[PDB]
């Protein structure tokens, strides 16, 4: 029953680990930090300055209307 065992044991893995809270888990996985979900701000204008030795700025418009 080792094949059946592998099957429902992996299912049990998914079920049980989904109960824990990203802590309490011995294999403390790294760098979750759940970032923001952004969630709407309608149409937006993004100002993005990056290092490329050099610095560049990209202005993104969400839609063609703006």
């Amino acid at each position: 029953t080792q094949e059946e065992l592998l099957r429902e044991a992996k299912i049990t893995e998914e079920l049980n680990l989904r109960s824990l809270e990203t802590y309490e888990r011995l294999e403390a996985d790294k760098k979750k930090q759940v970032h923001k979900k952004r969630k709407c701000p309608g149409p937006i204008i993004t100002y993005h300055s990056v290092t490329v030795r050099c610095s560049r700025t990209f202005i993104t418009f969400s839609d063609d209307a703006t």
């Binding site: 992996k10 049990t12 893995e13 049980n16 680990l17 824990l20 309490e24 888990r25 011995l26 294999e27």
Partner: protein, 244 residues
């Protein structure tokens, strides 16, 4: 019957054997956390005790992590011996028991004996059905209520914990436990510093904080209060305790 205890003691992890071996254990697919060498030795002793069809008491000192020892024994039993599926608990520690089961051995199905009368009947129905669960966790109150109803299902192993601090436990309940159809039984006792060379370090500090000038002024004000001098010398406990 004493031969069982003699054999268990012969293999028991005494102090020297509690640390002096290098059994190159591999992690059963269920288990995840790394035990101590001494907890690994306890795991090996439990596995041998079950393998030789023996019932034994956990003679380890109190506070050394019996939960993980039982969890790792369960993992090794299920993997090596293939007995893929009971624990008796008192109170909230039912939650801790299942939490540690899910933590160290998340691959085992868990059955919880908490619910309403309708929910408890449904839990019973699911508990009699095949391949429904692997580990059953129950409260001592439920066990006493279902002293005989628990007799219906047969078990690979059974664990008793916290009984020593449970009111109402009686020799008749022990007789029922023996009547329970667990091919092997385990008993946890806190009174059967220990094994500290591999336990957590627990570094403790105290640092001296010089009183601020304001604090010193207030301190000497409260001391010099003539009422406080009178109370200090008189020894009146309530007054001196107020000053303190």
């Amino acid at each position: 019957i004493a031969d069982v205890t003699a054999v268990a003691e012969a293999i028991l992890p005494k102090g020297s054997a509690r640390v002096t071996t290098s059994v190159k254990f591999n992690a059963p697919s269920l288990l995840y956390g790394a035990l101590r060498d001494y907890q690994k030795i306890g795991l090996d002793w439990l596995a041998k005790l079950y393998r030789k069809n023996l019932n034994g008491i956990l003679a380890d000192e109190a506070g050394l992590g019996k939960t993980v020892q039982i969890i790792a024994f369960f993992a090794h039993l299920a993997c090596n011996e293939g007995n893929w599926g009971l624990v008796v608990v008192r109170s909230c520690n039912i939650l801790k028991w299942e939490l540690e089961l899910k933590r160290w051995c998340p691959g085992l199905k868990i059955l919880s004996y908490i619910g309403s009368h309708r929910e408890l009947k449904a839990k019973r129905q699911e508990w009699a059905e095949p391949n429904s669960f692997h580990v059953c966790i129950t409260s001592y109150t439920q066990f006493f209520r279902g002293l005989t109803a628990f007799t219906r299902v047969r078990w690979k192993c059974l664990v008793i914990d916290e009984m020593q601090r449970v009111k109402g436990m009686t020799e008749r309940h022990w007789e029922a436990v023996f009547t329970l159809q667990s091919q092997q039984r385990l008993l946890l006792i806190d009174s059967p510093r220990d094994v500290e060379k591999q336990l957590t370090k627990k570094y403790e500090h105290v640092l001296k904080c010089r009183l601020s000038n304001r604090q010193k002024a207030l301190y000497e004000d409260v001391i010099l209060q003539p009422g406080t001098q009178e109370a200090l010398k008189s020894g009146h406990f309530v007054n001196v305790l107020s000053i303190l």
